Symmetry: C4
Amino acid sequence: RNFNNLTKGLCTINSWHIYGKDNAVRIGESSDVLVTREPYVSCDPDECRFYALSQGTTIRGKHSNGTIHDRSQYRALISWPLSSPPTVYNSRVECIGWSSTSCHDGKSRMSICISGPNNNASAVVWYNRRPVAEINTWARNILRTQESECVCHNGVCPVVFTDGSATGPADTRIYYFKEGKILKWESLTGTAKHIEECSCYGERTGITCTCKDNWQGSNRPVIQIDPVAMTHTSQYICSPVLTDNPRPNDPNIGKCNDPYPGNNNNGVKGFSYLDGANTWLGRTISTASRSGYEMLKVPNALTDDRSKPIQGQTIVLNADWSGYSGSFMDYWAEGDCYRACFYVELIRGRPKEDKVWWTSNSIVSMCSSTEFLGQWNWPDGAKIEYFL
Amino acid sequence: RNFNNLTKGLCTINSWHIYGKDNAVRIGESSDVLVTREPYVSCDPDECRFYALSQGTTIRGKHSNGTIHDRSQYRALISWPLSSPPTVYNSRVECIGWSSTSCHDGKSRMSICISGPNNNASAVVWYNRRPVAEINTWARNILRTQESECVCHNGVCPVVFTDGSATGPADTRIYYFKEGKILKWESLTGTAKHIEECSCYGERTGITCTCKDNWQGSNRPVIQIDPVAMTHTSQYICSPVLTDNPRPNDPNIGKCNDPYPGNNNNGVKGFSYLDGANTWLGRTISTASRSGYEMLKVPNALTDDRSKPIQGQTIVLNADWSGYSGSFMDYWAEGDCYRACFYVELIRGRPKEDKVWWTSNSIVSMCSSTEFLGQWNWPDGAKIEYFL
Amino acid sequence: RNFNNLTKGLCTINSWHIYGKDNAVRIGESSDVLVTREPYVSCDPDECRFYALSQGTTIRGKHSNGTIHDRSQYRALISWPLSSPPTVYNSRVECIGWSSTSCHDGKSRMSICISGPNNNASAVVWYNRRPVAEINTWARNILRTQESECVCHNGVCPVVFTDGSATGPADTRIYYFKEGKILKWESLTGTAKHIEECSCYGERTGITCTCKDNWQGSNRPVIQIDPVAMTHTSQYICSPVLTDNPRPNDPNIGKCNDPYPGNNNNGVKGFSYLDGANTWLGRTISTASRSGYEMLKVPNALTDDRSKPIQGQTIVLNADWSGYSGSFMDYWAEGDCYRACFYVELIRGRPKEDKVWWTSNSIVSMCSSTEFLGQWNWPDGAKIEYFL
Amino acid sequence: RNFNNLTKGLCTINSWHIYGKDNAVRIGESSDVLVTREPYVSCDPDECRFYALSQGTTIRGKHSNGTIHDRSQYRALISWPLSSPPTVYNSRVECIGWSSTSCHDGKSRMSICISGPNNNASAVVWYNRRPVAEINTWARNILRTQESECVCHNGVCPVVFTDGSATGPADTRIYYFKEGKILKWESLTGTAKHIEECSCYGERTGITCTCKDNWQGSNRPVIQIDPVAMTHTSQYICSPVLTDNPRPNDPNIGKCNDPYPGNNNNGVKGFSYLDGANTWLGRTISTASRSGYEMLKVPNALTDDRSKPIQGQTIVLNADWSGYSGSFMDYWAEGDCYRACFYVELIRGRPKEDKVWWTSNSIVSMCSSTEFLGQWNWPDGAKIEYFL
Ligand SMILES: *[C@@H]1O[C@H](CO)[C@@H](O[C@@H]2O[C@H](CO)[C@@H](O[C@@H]3O[C@H](CO[C@H]4O[C@H](CO[C@H]5O[C@H](CO)[C@@H](O)[C@H](O)[C@@H]5O)[C@@H](O)[C@H](O[C@H]5O[C@H](CO)[C@@H](O)[C@H](O)[C@@H]5O)[C@@H]4O)[C@@H](O)[C@H](O[C@H]4O[C@H](CO)[C@@H](O)[C@H](O)[C@@H]4O[C@H]4O[C@H](CO)[C@@H](O)[C@H](O)[C@@H]4O[C@H]4O[C@H](CO)[C@@H](O)[C@H](O)[C@@H]4O)[C@@H]3O)[C@H](O)[C@H]2NC(C)=O)[C@H](O)[C@H]1NC(C)=O
Ligand SMILES: *[C@@H]1O[C@H](CO)[C@@H](O[C@@H]2O[C@H](CO)[C@@H](O[C@@H]3O[C@H](CO[C@H]4O[C@H](CO[C@H]5O[C@H](CO)[C@@H](O)[C@H](O)[C@@H]5O)[C@@H](O)[C@H](O[C@H]5O[C@H](CO)[C@@H](O)[C@H](O)[C@@H]5O)[C@@H]4O)[C@@H](O)[C@H](O[C@H]4O[C@H](CO)[C@@H](O)[C@H](O)[C@@H]4O[C@H]4O[C@H](CO)[C@@H](O)[C@H](O)[C@@H]4O[C@H]4O[C@H](CO)[C@@H](O)[C@H](O)[C@@H]4O)[C@@H]3O)[C@H](O)[C@H]2NC(C)=O)[C@H](O)[C@H]1NC(C)=O
Ligand SMILES: *[C@@H]1O[C@H](CO)[C@@H](O[C@@H]2O[C@H](CO)[C@@H](O[C@@H]3O[C@H](CO[C@H]4O[C@H](CO[C@H]5O[C@H](CO)[C@@H](O)[C@H](O)[C@@H]5O)[C@@H](O)[C@H](O[C@H]5O[C@H](CO)[C@@H](O)[C@H](O)[C@@H]5O)[C@@H]4O)[C@@H](O)[C@H](O[C@H]4O[C@H](CO)[C@@H](O)[C@H](O)[C@@H]4O[C@H]4O[C@H](CO)[C@@H](O)[C@H](O)[C@@H]4O[C@H]4O[C@H](CO)[C@@H](O)[C@H](O)[C@@H]4O)[C@@H]3O)[C@H](O)[C@H]2NC(C)=O)[C@H](O)[C@H]1NC(C)=O
Ligand SMILES: *[C@@H]1O[C@H](CO)[C@@H](O[C@@H]2O[C@H](CO)[C@@H](O[C@@H]3O[C@H](CO[C@H]4O[C@H](CO[C@H]5O[C@H](CO)[C@@H](O)[C@H](O)[C@@H]5O)[C@@H](O)[C@H](O[C@H]5O[C@H](CO)[C@@H](O)[C@H](O)[C@@H]5O)[C@@H]4O)[C@@H](O)[C@H](O[C@H]4O[C@H](CO)[C@@H](O)[C@H](O)[C@@H]4O[C@H]4O[C@H](CO)[C@@H](O)[C@H](O)[C@@H]4O[C@H]4O[C@H](CO)[C@@H](O)[C@H](O)[C@@H]4O)[C@@H]3O)[C@H](O)[C@H]2NC(C)=O)[C@H](O)[C@H]1NC(C)=O
Ligand SMILES: COCCNC(=O)O[C@@H]([C@@H]1OC(C(=O)O)=C[C@H](NC(=N)N)[C@H]1NC(C)=O)[C@H](O)CO
Ligand SMILES: COCCNC(=O)O[C@@H]([C@@H]1OC(C(=O)O)=C[C@H](NC(=N)N)[C@H]1NC(C)=O)[C@H](O)CO
Ligand SMILES: [Ca+2]
Ligand SMILES: [Ca+2]
Ligand SMILES: [Ca+2]
Ligand SMILES: [Ca+2]
């Protein structure tokens, strides 16, 4: 085995096809399915798997009561087979904590979990299923990271962290790991003003991360990372097609170097694929809440502050709950291009559905097609009444 | 590993022996067994497994209510170990959708799932557990495929699709895949007038598919495919031993080139082994409904429009529910011949048993013997009253 | 991998140590544990596993009602990891039927299952998880075999079958298989007058099988098989230490060449290790029913019709239910000798405990020690009241 | 594969990071989780796993009633994947009994289980999943061993046993095994006056075991073993920082060569890392009961009878129940040093929580960091009321 190198460009994205769906909440109505949230997907050279933060209880279990809470000692990053649900019996624990990232470098997998109280959190970096390095909180205010997969090049895997205020200036760092060891870290530079929960992908041009501005922005900040020089830059998606949630209505001029205003102290993890005319943006359909999901083809969205959609695809109807979304790719697939993929978290339970006392989710996932495929919509599919 | 070649003829079929049975509904009365339908069986070089379309819920789960429905977003092709039941914890998801086929080419497995709304469905072709090619609906009317295994020769795996009316002329295509990539497709030729749900097997003479005519026919259409030239022909089984369901009584002259009339707009997936004097036909015992199952030795059934049974074997009593049936073989077994095999879907629940609100099934499977073995009958075995 | 050869003698048996115990009924009170009976143990070169005939239902499942019945279509030979219980999710189906044997030859495993109605049963011989040969009933009266492991030498694995009356003269055959193919079979010769459910083991002197006489005998018939010449002889254990159940009290003169009388038309599967002064016999403690279990050191028991115990060990108290017992050894263990092992079936439920409507069992297993170890007793451990 | 050699020293311990946590009782409220106690952790060259003594029943199972009892026939040493809970379906049985140890020597794993009545117990030594050697009770009074992992050097794995009184002088032996075979054993020498449940680790200086004095001592006895010479010495931890439970308050002068008095006929399994200025001691926070857990940096604690803490870390709040604790390390990790690790048993149920009728536990585990990481606390997390 050799370290994977990012030698390919993105495949042409003409539509999106169904990749995976686990129907976790449906199945969990009568099965030992773990309560989760903050899911994602990540590939090894020989297998792709679902990931999520467990809440250390099943949905039918009485301990599901209160799982709207974000940061307990009973949480852990788990992985399980593609499109299976996360069950007590098929879930592999990667590490313990309530914020995570994970990625394979071609030889072995790095996984990172953050745990601890708000003012005293720490990250533990696992490599090849062993703890290798540790990072203590530097701002004493909820040290947190991506909640989706990281990306590697020639053994080097960058990861974005944030420590500090959720509602003001914070201390964001980009760490560069190799075999779990810290090669270098640097403070955030560029014009992004607040950074959380970056969704990343790699291609021959480097590594691209689409994050969340939780402070003042409803446009998404972008961090572009050179994994060889181990340097980065940041800005926002220039496009007036805004992709945070909640968010204002789409203007006709976006912002490249500053937060687009209207919604403060909130946001949702999201993603994009920024690739010239091959650019696609994901967002919730609702501007008010985490419902619905759509992909929009927005040429040069990253750099064009006038750019508008020329094509689209509905993934989840606005009538259905969505949630977090993020990027991943199978870097070990055959062919001459990397096929763009993403997942959407379909949150069920609280706060929006409070007849139950739990909060969980299921997963739906799509990858790009060079065909122009017909579209469906993909609801979680569970009936809340069944849980009462 | 090399691509498998179809170098052997069928073993002499003198009777049928029990190969597998999962008792899924019995066990699912008190276990986390997934609701399924449209099952089949397919072999890898080192393992044979059961396959089926899950409904994304267990039988005891409250979401089992309404699983008579064919095409939800909660369906997926799953596989699980031979004669185990399809449980939440032992089922491997092959792809997402509500119509499927799957086969191993000697090196890796190709799986195909179709999903989407009726007027906008698409097929995704997986190879070695990765999505490789996609096919959009060409007639905008429930793009659908075999619901049993495909067959490969030297890397080339043909698959029969249909798009269009279930009750009139439709657009049937034969696709030729290699490592999941589309080599060629062609429109249906020959005298078959309607094609659905082909059951296929391969032998030195080529690949033989026995399908269903859902429009006007109660004799079964046959497609014969040359996987090297990548060409095909079609007709019907000439025999007056009719093997669709529902169906008229057996006449004394069959039809080779046209549907045998009497029953319109219905049918059941079925199969046959067409091999000169070594020919055996499968069918439900009832002419009215999906109950019972029998094998009949009908010499030259394919080409002889007068051919009658000279030997038989009951598989399922008429008193017991059956359903779909299809062909598979272990192409990687030892010996000088391919041993013919088949499965029978044993449907329980709706519409025939409507005291419950679900529809599911279990599997029974037989392979041929050169001995003349005593016969048993093989019911699903579950008591519906237990589910009330 | 090479075929295993029987090149060692038995280890000196000075006592018995605990080898395995699955506590299946205890655990099955609240878990998806399959109803079983007729268990045994058998080793691969890299793993030893528990085996049993499932009833195709869990204990808590409503279909457990009526599992006192011996021969349904819902039975199958299953295997599962050593001392785990047989669960829906961890059990591997070896073949379908209601009477079985199984053994590894050093390269691959042969498994045999018999299914069918009483007058039309057939055996299917699997090798390396594929069906290879089939045998039709020759006496049309419950074709049946060992219900414990077979033994192989240089690829040749003998198996004892019986077809015919349970209460009179029957047709017993010894089959010789290699890679699942039938090399030879022969009719029973020697002085044994009725043969069922042989328990076998192999050592440098050949293969020794201790069986059950269900007709007139309460001494156990013995079949000694030369796996190279593929020939055999038979007699009874000469010892007056009688080891069937039910049975008369121990006399002072046994019978070598005829059934020891007193109990007709009944018996229990059992075993022995016949090795000169290193001879140990297993039996139920009760003479009336399947309760208790003990090992007795009886020098030259096979050939000495006066032989008596000089040492012993209680395995199960008479107050506790037992059942079938049989022999197995790890032929792939290190060292200069084969360590004798056995299992005892601990039957719970009907007919003896009829407040429940099911019949199942758990397993306890011991292997020999060259030490003189202290003894314990090993009950099933489940409380029937919990199931009411 | 080669035998592992202890060629490294301990990593510098500046704090402790979360390594694993299974939340077994939380999950077991609604899942098939086995009742356990006496857990530990142990690594293979390619995997680290949780271990414990099962009680042969799930927590929700009715047979959980009475599991406060220590030594039934329904107990077994089981192992399961790191931070998964011990479920019926994912637990591997290592051997049968109610006292155990286990360790990998670099080539294969040795596991030892003791079973039997109080006056007639015996140990069975398994190697590479096969029984290899047996040891009969030598004092006829509850033969018992470590309840945490053993340690190997060049194939030689020492294990500490005790047979005899829990409340007076007993017969302690150190056994030296290789590939499960007994190389040598010796009676306890040195100044330790009573020995139970040793927690061991290995480093270039040899093998160090921290045990429990159940008779008169509240300081912990230490056994230091040379695995090459196969000899040992014993004393107590000299430090006045006392680490048994229950225990007196910390004095200012400890005892090196005798039990520190105040508490008789009780104790808890515990551990330490004794490494000059890099020394850390574990103990319950409460002096009265098994509640809370803390690590204390106590320079030269082993040899300095005046030594006091200069740094610490809370692991479990005093308000939360703890229990046994023990040492393990990943001897197959990369780097130039062995990273110290430990687990804490979090006991729930009886005797302290007697509204339920069971006794079980979950596991939390930490490894050392060279960083000075912020601390959290790690409760079991289950609510007893949910079980009523
Ligand atoms: C079977 O499946 C297939 C495959 O999926 C289905 O075909 C798909 O159908 C869907 C639905 O119609 C399409 O998605 C939409 O795409 C449009 C973009 O395409 C249109 O516009 C293009 C650009 O036109 C402009 O530029 C060109 C440049 O040359 C210029 O020529 C033109 O005059 C104009 O200036 C056109 O090129 C394009 O034409 C092409 O495609 C046609 C088919 O689509 C074809 O007929 C033509 O011949 C030609 O080939 C086409 O006209 C997206 O704009 C649209 O997304 C908007 O609308 C949805 C609601 O449907 C909304 O959710 C989106 O967010 C977005 O609307 C918001 O954002 C806008 C941008 O900021 C804003 O302006 C809007 O007002 C709106 O804003 C409001 O809502 C949001 C969300 O809540 C909120 O945040 C805001 O604040 C505000 O409140 C769809 O994505 C697929 O492209 C199409 N795919 C294919 C391959 O055809 C087929 O229908 C299915 N069949 C059946 C029977 O069902
Ligand atoms: C232990 O197990 C063994 C092994 O399984 C059991 O032995 C088996 O027993 C079964 C049951 O009897 C047999 O299955 C039947 O086979 C017959 C065919 O065999 C008969 O016919 C042969 C052909 O005869 C013709 O041609 C020859 C050519 O030379 C000529 O000589 C002859 O005069 C005649 O012209 C004979 O060769 C054959 O004889 C041989 O076998 C005998 C044993 O079977 C033996 O005794 C002889 O010595 C000789 O060796 C034999 O006579 C099938 O025809 C039959 O299938 C029909 O019947 C079942 C109902 O049982 C039905 O479900 C089938 O669908 C079919 O009937 C329908 O289709 C016909 C064709 O269209 C139609 O004509 C019928 O009217 C009927 O149609 C109606 O029903 C269908 C279904 O609902 C509906 O769709 C229609 O519209 C309409 O309503 C059986 O398959 C096995 O072959 C046999 N196996 C062996 C190895 O022996 C044994 O019994 C068990 N033991 C015990 C104690 O239980
Ligand atoms: C800790 O654990 C250890 C290790 O397990 C325990 O030690 C074990 O203790 C058990 C229980 O006592 C022993 O099992 C019994 O063994 C005897 C055989 O040993 C005795 O007999 C030997 C033979 O004596 C004869 O021959 C010699 C030849 O030289 C001659 O010298 C002698 O005079 C006589 O002629 C003796 O050699 C032997 O002495 C040796 O061992 C002694 C310790 O055992 C030691 O003290 C001596 O110094 C010497 O070293 C000893 O005297 C078995 O006979 C016995 O089995 C019978 O009894 C049980 C009931 O307990 C019964 O279930 C059996 O079926 C059997 O009884 C039936 O069968 C007989 C034969 O047909 C029949 O005659 C009986 O009437 C009876 O029949 C009735 O019941 C059956 C069953 O229902 C029914 O079918 C019939 O029809 C009828 O109704 C036990 O197996 C272990 O051997 C022993 N192991 C060791 C290593 O010591 C220790 O006790 C534990 N410690 C504590 C504190 O618990
Ligand atoms: C974010 O996380 C970080 C990282 O975890 C947190 O920082 C940690 O904070 C904890 C809690 O404070 C610390 O644990 C305690 O450590 C002390 C030891 O450190 C103190 O003492 C050192 C030694 O001082 C002596 O020697 C030096 C030698 O030169 C001499 O200079 C000095 O004058 C004195 O003679 C000092 O060196 C040390 O200073 C250093 O550290 C300071 C920060 O801690 C820093 O500010 C300084 O600048 C300097 O760098 C410091 O003063 C342990 O003693 C203590 O353990 C005792 O207390 C706990 C209760 O908290 C108790 O459970 C323990 O068992 C123990 O107390 C018992 O045992 C004693 C010994 O026998 C006995 O004397 C006591 O009376 C007591 O006995 C009673 O209770 C027990 C238990 O029930 C019973 O058995 C007895 O019988 C009796 O009833 C803690 O372990 C960490 O060290 C610290 N880590 C780091 C890296 O800083 C941070 O707080 C978090 N942030 C937030 C916002 O929460
Ligand atoms: C008016 O009818 C239009 C919709 N009906 C339809 O398509 O039914 C078809 C199949 O029928 C059955 C069956 O049991 O009869 C089960 C399959 N279910 C699957 N999920 N695969 C069906 N195939 C599909 C793609 O749904 C039938 O062959 C007619 O075309
Ligand atoms: C009068 O007492 C005689 C019986 N008590 C006894 O043996 O308790 C011992 C251990 O205690 C505890 C505990 O939690 O304190 C849990 C262990 N349980 C296991 N199943 N291993 C016990 N070990 C055994 C072999 O039972 C103790 O160390 C005294 O010797
Ligand atoms: Ca925002
Ligand atoms: Ca039809
Ligand atoms: Ca008898
Ligand atoms: Ca003590």
